[PDB]
């Protein structure tokens, strides 16, 4: 059973994702230029959001020695700690390690015990550190995104064996693409000097780039893989799904928001339950050309509804029913027109949609899975 | 070769907006996306008027696009075969070296019109090892006379000389 | 008789097939650069899919000794099996044989049975192991893909005599190529440090690569060779063909799909029945250039249809009729012409298309072979 | 009279022919590197095709004693057959002689008849054996490809002097050069293990080589030498010509076709009736580049048409006009949009092209000659 989210979201002129130079990230889809928000950026915005604060367990850092000393509270262990980290396969470079370590925070204190044992052998302490690092995967974010960790063996140690450190991700996120052609815009700026002078020049002169766009976003979650990754826990899995839905429906990237502030909520969400993952991004191969009688969002939702209905009636299966939930605030946008009904329920509220989603998985309640 | 020097210096003098304009036009023609055509015409046309010599249009366009994608500080004495040999020497001599050498030796078979991606993989390997310099003037001069046999001979000989030491 | 499946499929921006340098696999077709998906990627994605799950009969692996020991139940039957495999022509290298072995999963029980027997000498047991390995070729995937095994004769015992091992593959798959020209793109990423420190710098910094293109995929199935390789069971062959079509329709390569998730269903599937295999890859020698009014997929289907019409009217003989089925989701796209229909029956459904091809091939039904 | 066929064929990325190192075969033409397909590869792929199966009446084998035993049934004569084969100067290295022997398959019954009976002696029978292999030339494939066989001299029976055992070739096939530059490509492949283990490594890592190109194929058939090779069988010769045209048009070499499946049809066929052979391979001394306004196949066909016009205008002779046919499926590709005059007849159907070729050859119909 796979739970999928398809989002249509308009965005006022902003620069949500950049590159080396500073241009907004673009891509080609259907032979035309688009506007793109990278899936890594969306995943990070979801992970460090307010609705995901209660579930942020893991940490991905190159400064494990500082965290170990902070959980310990005494000075002289810190240097010793990095020596331990030099024997597990993390060669330090300029006060920090050379590679990122992604692990749950709740096991970090156990790391402190290893640098709190002055009777332990160095090789034995390194082996115990490697084991407890390999076993630190009980957190919702690590379960969702997965982990690959390969400590080097050029200068690691002898007779130190690493267990399997690999988690298969239960979350797939597609790069967002604009539902129309891309029109980048250039803003010429100057930096006025606060002090009068003899020339009345500017402190600085330069440019910035920005673009407004209607994006399509796609998330997919495997329920069985998530449950297996969370060591058989179901209440924490339901909490993860609910918090993920609420965070992905109500959080935006934090890139150049101090100057553009595009905090726009989505004007349509499709939540599907099916045995295979499908993405309706092929709907907007022909770019949405704006007509005067309507706007960007209405035509985009109409084309999406057309493709969704054609796919549902085209790849129809008998032994696998499809249950769909359609959400729009106060039913502001239905599934376009030219159809009787496609989704089972047209929910007009976000929390009611979350409650229905948690009810579908067996009948869990949001307030009681909050306790996990 | 003063025209090539002026071309490269004007390329370094570019701001970020037209650099992004050129970056968006990788792998493309010259007949679409008019701002790219106007910027390239502004870059290349004054060279012919003053200087009697000027780099070829296809070579100049390829160099401009490669510079936009792979911004490198122009420095005399950093030719591409020498850096490629220095990278190739610090490699595994059984598997990685034949593959990377095949990717390098693919270059000395095509024309100017098809060297973009086989050069972009080379610049990607260079950027992987954190280079900070490249002789754009020498590369442009070599690419101009790419049909002369001693040019390719010196290219390969410089690569082998840098590889051997 | 040959069953050909042609697919026109548009994909989201993704990196579904890379090389040693982490760039999307490309090729040079028609004199221009195109984006390519290797045939091995498509075959592996088909083989390990949910629709093909009931037919995963064969296993191709280097560690056969582990399978023999696991089937035999106990643990001490590991080094002995390694000795038998070493005497069969498979030299070991750090508890792993050098060469991959492809064989049906049903005969591993027999291998555990012979290895567990301690009353038989080394050479004759090796001979029986070689015989049962050579005769273990009954599986749908082995029938489709074929088998090769050339044991190292310089390491094997001189008393071991191998029978035939090569199986003729009853399936051909083409490297998928993009209809239009290729536009590779470079994605700049960094990995953020999650804790404050001294500098505001990130962790890793890198430049990955990705590209989006509309692909033309081609598969061919030989009916007689499939039935012959499946030891004459036509029901298994029909089930294999139906499940193969279902798995090729609704499965995509898993390369870097956790970050890109280009799970796009094909926008055109055409099925033909004819005695000689032909690929319509020459429909796109000239790249499809998008115009301001039409789109990519519709233009690709139109060009493919024009070339199909030219082939059908240019290479037609009365002595070999051709029956074609064209599938588009709820008839989203027409193919045959702008006014004519070259497909004998347009299908707006996938299961109905599968039932139709089975009914033409033998009158078989999906409720019997499955 | 000579029938010459020139074909333009663009191929999907594949490796239809390769050398000992696995790389696709290349050659130097006009100072530029082009991709090549060897002529023997094309000849074998046409010869062993399904569309030529009704004409395959010859076997080029190394194990003749095995065929003798398999056609004699159950009576043991395999050592005896090997001995008599050794007596006529063929040697024997573990059931296979040192040389390949080309001979029609109809004559194995006669060899079985001579080897079975003990009424005749050994050495004279060996001489008799020679008289069957020197006269087993009534096969279409022997008539087309041609055979030469020179037996040994250090182990002959001194009474087994041979007749003339050669057949002049009635078909000349060129090496299929490419119309443009060579673009070799490397496919980096891996082969994974179905059973998970400790590491993430795979079973095998390697690289293969492939290239995509437009090939120019050239074939020539000598009608008089063909009908002399089959001893005046004009009907059978016309059947061979028609079946050869069908097989050459509708078949590709089977090299790495289970991984690439480049089953591409030709995009243009030019069939000319001449008295002296001419090759249009010099049409592409300058390699064919690509312009956005056209594509590779159209540019190649235009270059071929320009060179054909040059050849016809520069070597016109009123004593021997040349009649040619141009074929493209549904007239998709004409002979360049500049002349419309080098093609005497424009044909859009392959069967109509074959029928017109046969009618020019002897006035026969295809369905008459197919049996």
Three-state SS string across D116-154, please? Answer: HCCCCCHHHHHHHHHHHHCCCCCCHHHHHHCEECCCCCC
Asked whether the beta carbons of residue A207 and residue B15 sit closer than 8 angstroms, the reply is: yes
Chain B interface mutation, best of C22, C28, C35, C184, highest count of B Cβ atoms under 10 Å: C184
Q: Does D33 contact B at CB distance below 8 Å?
A: yes
CA dist., res. D111 & res. C94, Å (int): 56
Measured in residues, chain B has a length of 165
**Distance (Å) from the C-alpha of residue B20 to the closest C-alpha of chain A?**
7
**Token pair recorded at residue C4:** 């050909």
Q: Is D40 on the interface with C (CB under 8 A)?
A: no
Give the whole-angstrom CA distance, residue C359 versus residue C346: 15
| Contact in structure between C123 and C160 (CB atoms under 8 Å) | yes
Query: Residue C327's beta-bridge partner residues?
Result: C269, C347
Does D169 reach chain B within 8 Å, measured CB to CB?
A: no
> Cα–Cα distance between D137 and D106 in angstroms, integer?
10
End-to-end CA distance of chain D: 24
Report how far residue A225's alpha carbon sits from residue C92's, in angstroms, rounded to the nearest whole number.
Answer: 35
Burial class (CB in 10 A: 0-12, 13-18, 19+), C150: exposed
Structure tokens at D128: 């008799």
Nearest to D295 among C19, C30, C36 (CB): C30
Displacement of CA A14 from its chain's centroid (Å)? 20
Nearest CA in chain B to A19: B20
Q: Is D189 helix (H, G, I), strand (E, B) or coil?
A: strand
Sign of CA dihedral C10, C12, C18, C24: positive
Q: Which residue has the tokens 């950093």?
A: B78
Distance from CA of A34 to the nearest CA of B (A): 12
CA distance D180 to D215: 9
Q: How far apart are CA D132 and CA D162, in angstroms?
A: 11
Cβ–Cβ of C220/D12 closer than 8 Å? no
Comparing CB atoms, the residue among C189, C263, C295 nearest residue A286 is: C295
Question: In chain A, what residues touch C260 (CB-CB under 8 Å)?
Answer: 39, 174-175
Give C325's strand partners. Answer: C271, C345
Q: How far is CA A187 from the centre of its chain?
A: 30
Evaluate whether A222 touches A2 at the Cβ level (below 8 Å).
Answer: yes
Q: Which of D44, D54, D46 is nearest to D236 (CA)?
A: D54
Question: Can you say whether residue A117 is alpha, beta or left, with left for phi > 0 and alpha for psi between -120 and 50 degrees?
Answer: beta
Backbone angles phi, psi at B35, to 5 degrees: -55, -35
Contact state of A314 with C297 under an 8 Å Cβ cutoff: no
Give the β-pairing of D185-191 and D204-210.
antiparallel
> How far D73 CA lies from chain C's nearest CA (Å)?
23
3 state SS of B79:
coil
Contact by Cβ (8 Å): D102, D58: yes
- Report the largest interatomic distance among the alpha carbons of chain C, rounded to a whole angstrom: 81
Residue A291: CB partners within 8 Å, gap ≥ 6? Answer: A299
Residues 6+ apart with CB under 8 A from A321: none
Phi, psi of A194 (to 5 degrees): -80, -10
Judge whether C317 is closer than 8 Å to chain B, CB to CB.
no
- Tell me the two tokens of residue C60: 């191709």
Cα angle D125, D127, D128 (rounded to 5 degrees) comes to: 60
Alpha-carbon torsion D257, D258, D262, D266, what sign?
positive
C21 touches chain A (CB under 8 A): no
For helices C122-134 and C79-87, angle between their N-to-C axes, nearest 10 degrees: 80
Place of tokens 């030719």: B79
| Cα D94 versus chain centre, distance | 31
Q: What is the DSSP letter of A345?
A: E
Method of determination used here: cryo-EM
Strand partners, D274: D2
Closest Cα in chain C to A308? C329
How many degrees, rounded to 5, is the angle at CA D5 between CA D1 and CA D11?
A: 170
All residues of chain A having their beta carbon less than 8 Å from the beta carbon of residue B15 are 207
B15 touches chain A (CB under 8 A): yes
Q: Give the dihedral of Cα atoms B34, B39, B43, B44; nearest 10 deg.
A: 0
Inform me whether the C-beta atom of residue B33 falls under 8 Å from chain A C-beta atoms. no
Burial readout D127-146 (b: 16 or more C-beta within 10 A, e: otherwise):
ebbbeebeebbbbbbbbbbb
Judged by DSSP in three states, A167 sits in: strand
Alpha helices in chain C (DSSP H): 39-47, 64-72, 79-87, 108-116, 122-134, 140-145, 223-229, 234-249, 296-314, 350-361, 366-369
Q: Does B150 touch chain C (CB under 8 A)?
A: no
Where residue C52 falls (left for φ over 0; alpha for ψ -120 to 50; beta otherwise) is alpha
How far B27 CA sits from the closest chain C CA (Å)? 7
Number of H helices, E strands in chain D: 11, 15
C167 close to C138: Cβ distance less than 8 angstroms: no
Instruction: Compute the nearest-CA separation of C197 from chain A (Å).
Output: 8
CB C359 within 8 A of CB C351: no
Tokens representing residue D337 in the block: 């949009």
Strands D345-347 and D323-327: parallel
Which of C62, C169, C175 is nearest residue D203 as measured by Cβ atoms?
C62
β strands within chain A, DSSP E = 2-14, 26-29, 32-37, 58-61, 92-93, 96-97, 101-104, 147-148, 166-167, 171-178, 185-192, 202-222, 269-274, 323-327, 345-347
SS3 letters across D73-113:
CCCCCHHHHHHHHHHECCCCECCECCCCEEEEHHHHHHHHH
Query: What span, in angstroms and rounded, lies between the C-alpha atoms of A103 and C344?
Result: 59
- Enter the resolution in angstroms: 3.4
For every residue of D280-340, DSSP letters joined together read -GGGGSS-----TTS-HHHHHHHHHHHHHHHHHHHS--TTS--EEEEE-GGG-S-S-TTTS
Token readout for A313 is: 């009636």
Please tell me the distance from the alpha carbon of residue B131 to that of residue C325, in angstroms, as a whole number. Answer: 56
Q: Which two tokens stand for residue A303?
A: 């084309």
Check: CB of residue C348 under 8 Å from CB of residue C331: yes
Vertex B133: Cα angle to B129 and B138 (nearest 5): 120
Nearest Cα neighbor of C213 from C175, C174, C182 is C182
CB of A348 within 8 Å of any CB in chain C? no
Question: Phi and psi at residue A245, in whole multiples of 5°?
Answer: -65, -45
Q: What six digits make up the tokens of D171?
A: 């078909």
Helix (H) or strand (E) holding A269: strand A269-274
Burial-class residue C345 by CB neighbours within 10 Å (0-12, 13-18, 19+). middle
Whether C50 contacts chain A with CB within 8 A = yes
Residues of chain C found within 8 Å of residue B103, distances taken between Cβ atoms: 21
The pair of three-digit structure tokens given for residue C224, joined into one six-digit string:
């007689």
Chosen for mutation from C20, C22, C182, C206 (greatest number of chain B CBs closer than 10 Å) is C20
Cβ pair C23:B121 closer than 8 A: yes
The span from the CA of C246 to the CA of A320, in Å, is 14
Pairwise CA distance, residues D138 & D146, whole Å: 11
C183 chain-B contacts, CB cut-off 8 A:
27
Residue A282 has its nearest CB partner, among C210, C260, C267, at: C267
Buried b (16+ CB within 10 A) or exposed e, C315-326: beeeeeeeebbb
The phi, psi pair for A311, rounded to 5°, reads: -70, -40
Contacts of C26 in chain B (CB under 8 A): 117
Strands (E) in A15-110, as ranges, are 26-29, 32-37, 58-61, 92-93, 96-97, 101-104
* Rg of chain A on CA atoms, in Å: 25
Q: What is the CA radius of gyration of chain C?
A: 25
Decide the pairing of beta strands B73-74 and B133-134: parallel
Cβ distance D181 to B102 less than 8 Å, yes or no, reads no
What's chain D's Rg over C-alpha atoms? 25
Contact status of C182 with chain B (Cβ, < 8 Å): yes
Note whether C137 and C147 are within 8 A (CB). yes
Q: Chains with ≥3 Cβ pairs under 8 A against B?
A: A, C, D
Distance CA B88, CA B101 (A): 8
Q: Are C260 and C209 in contact (CB under 8 A)?
A: no
Residues of chain C contacting B97 with CB distance shorter than 8 Å = none
Q: From CA D302, how far away is CA D308, in angstroms rounded?
A: 10
B17 closest CB neighbour out of A26, A33, A207: A207
D122 touches chain B (CB under 8 A): no
D58 within 8 A of D142, measured Cβ to Cβ: yes
Check CB contact of A67 with chain C, cutoff 8 Å: yes
Chain B residues with beta carbon closer than 8 angstroms to that of A210: none
Would you state the structure tokens that stand for residue B85, as one six-digit string? Answer: 């040999």
Residues D304 and D272: beta-carbon distance below 8 Å: no
User: Which backbone phi and psi does C42 adopt, to 5 degrees?
Assistant: -65, -45
C165 and C197 Cβ atoms separated by less than 8 Å? no
User: Which tokens is D306 given?
Assistant: 């320009």
The answer to whether the Cα torsion of D201, D204, D205, D210 is positive or negative is negative
């Amino acid at each position: 059973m796979l739970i999928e989210i398809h989002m249509i979201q308009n965005h006022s002129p902003a620069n949500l994702n950049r590159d080396d130079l500073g241009a907004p990230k673009t891509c080609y889809f259907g032979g035309v230029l688009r506007s793109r928000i990278s899936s890594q950026c969306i995943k990070r915005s979801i992970r460090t959001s307010n609705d995901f604060k209660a579930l942020l367990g893991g940490v991905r850092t190159r400064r494990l020695a500082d965290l170990i000393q902070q959980e310990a509270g005494e000075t002289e262990c810190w240097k010793k700690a990095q020596e331990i980290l030099n024997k597990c396969g993390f060669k330090n470079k300029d006060d920090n390690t050379k590679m990122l370590v992604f692990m749950s925070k709740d096991k970090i204190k156990d790391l402190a015990r290893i640098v709190l044992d002055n009777s332990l052998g160095l090789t034995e302490a390194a082996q115990q550190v490697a084991n407890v690092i390999a076993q630190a995967t009980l957190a919702p974010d690590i379960a969702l995104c997965g982990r690959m960790l390969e400590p080097n063996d050029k200068d690691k140690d002898k007779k130190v064996k690493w267990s399997n450190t690999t988690v298969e991700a239960a979350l797939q996120v597609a790069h967002a693409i604009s539902t129309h052609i891309a029109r980048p815009e250039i803003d010429y700026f100057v930096a006025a000097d606060d002090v009068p002078g003899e020339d009345a020049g500017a402190g600085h002169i330069g440019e910035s780039m920005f673009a407004s766009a209607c994006f399509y976003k796609y998330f997919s979650i495997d329920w069985e893989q998530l449950v297996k990754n969370l060591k058989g826990d179901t209440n924490l899995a339901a909490h993860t799904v609910g918090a993920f839905l609420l965070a992905a429906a109500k959080t935006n990237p934090s890139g150049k928001q101090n100057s553009f502030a595009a905090h726009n909520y989505p004007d349509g969400i499709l939540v599907e339950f099916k045995n295979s993952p499908i993405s309706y991004a092929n709907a907007f191969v022909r770019p949405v050309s704006v007509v005067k009688e309507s706007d960007l969002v209405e035509q985009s939702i109409g084309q999406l509804s057309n493709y969704v209905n054609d796919i549902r009636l085209g790849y129809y299966d008998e032994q696998s029913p499809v249950i769909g939930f359609w959400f729009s605030p106060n039913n502001r946008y239905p599934l376009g027109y030219k159809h009787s009904k496609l989704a089972s329920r047209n929910i007009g509220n976000l929390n009611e949609l979350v409650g229905a989603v948690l009810d579908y998985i067996g009948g869990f309640k949001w307030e009681e899975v909050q306790k996990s | 070769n003063r025209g090539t020097v002026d071309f490269i210096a004007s390329l370094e003098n570019l701001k970020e907006g037209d650099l992004g304009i050129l970056r968006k036009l990788r792998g493309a023609r010259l007949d679409e996306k008019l701002p790219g055509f106007d910027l390239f015409s502004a870059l290349w046309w004054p060279l012919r008027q003053k200087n009697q010599r000027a780099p070829k249009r296809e070579v100049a366009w390829l160099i401009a696009k490669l510079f936009a994608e792979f911004r490198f500080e122009q420095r005399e004495g950093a030719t591409l075969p020498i850096l490629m040999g220095g990278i190739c020497r610090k490699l595994e001599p059984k598997k990685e070296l034949p593959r990377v050498l095949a990717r390098f030796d693919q270059l000395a078979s095509l024309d100017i019109m098809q060297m973009e991606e086989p050069l972009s993989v080379i610049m990607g390997i260079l950027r992987k090892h954190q280079q900070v310099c490249l002789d754009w003037v020498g590369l442009t001069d070599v690419l101009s006379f790419w049909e002369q046999e001693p040019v390719k001979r010196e290219w390969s000989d410089s690569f082998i000389k840098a590889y051997k030491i």
